[PDB]
Amino acid sequence: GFNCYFPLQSYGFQPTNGVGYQPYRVVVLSFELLHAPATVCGPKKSTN
């Protein structure tokens, strides 16, 4: 009603939008250091 709105809105994504309104996929990598064993480690720099 007046000054009452559903809090969510849709993004009207179209290929015709300028770049700032084109959709972007965002993935954020949150890296956690817990008491748990580390389990996520990059490759080992081994040699001959």
Binding site: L34, H35, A36, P37
Partner: protein, 42 residues
């Protein structure tokens, strides 16, 4: 044992044998749980 780790050895017997052996590591990893009590899963 407490972080939490497990060692084991499985051998046949024929109410424990009067002997000695040393157990090998089975599980080794922290979880953040205070273990003061335990129960088996049947």
């Amino acid at each position: 044992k407490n972080y939490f780790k497990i060692y084991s050895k499985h051998t046949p017997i024929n109410d424990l044998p009067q002997g000695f052996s040393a157990l090998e590591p089975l599980v080794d990893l922290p979880i953040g749980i205070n273990i003061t009590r335990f129960q088996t899963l049947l």
